[PDB]
Chain A
Amino acid sequence: AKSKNHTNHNQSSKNHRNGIKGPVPLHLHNSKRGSWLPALVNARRVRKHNQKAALKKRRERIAAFAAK
């Protein structure tokens, strides 16, 4: 007994019932995994120095607040 082969009749209605959700904004899930390696390695060294500077800046702010 033959039956129906394929259809897309109601699929658009089902998809839009909860809506076609918009894409994740570019500022989230912006991982650089798998990108060009030499730039990634160079950026890692910069970020490590930035973390050290961030630690020093907070130490200075703590001392400044304590003194004042």
Chain B
Amino acid sequence: VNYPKKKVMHCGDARCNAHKSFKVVQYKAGKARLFARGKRRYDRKQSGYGGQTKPVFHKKAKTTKKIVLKLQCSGCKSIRQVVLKRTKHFELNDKKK
């Protein structure tokens, strides 16, 4: 799926409250922090004898992921997140066919 690099869409913030030009960036998850609360609990549980204490998922079935696009306002600098349908090939394209 080809998606435009810019989108004219309504901005909810009080500064705009109107259709604005948003820059498009695909979402990528951040790195898991070592000192996150769940990660700290997991490491405490894992320490010592007893082997693996939590399930490790193996039976992967999905071949795709839902595309999340982060729209950054030109003036507001705030970001909105939208979800597209699952696809195998997502690219940001300006050249309209």
Direct contact of A and B (CB under 8 A): no
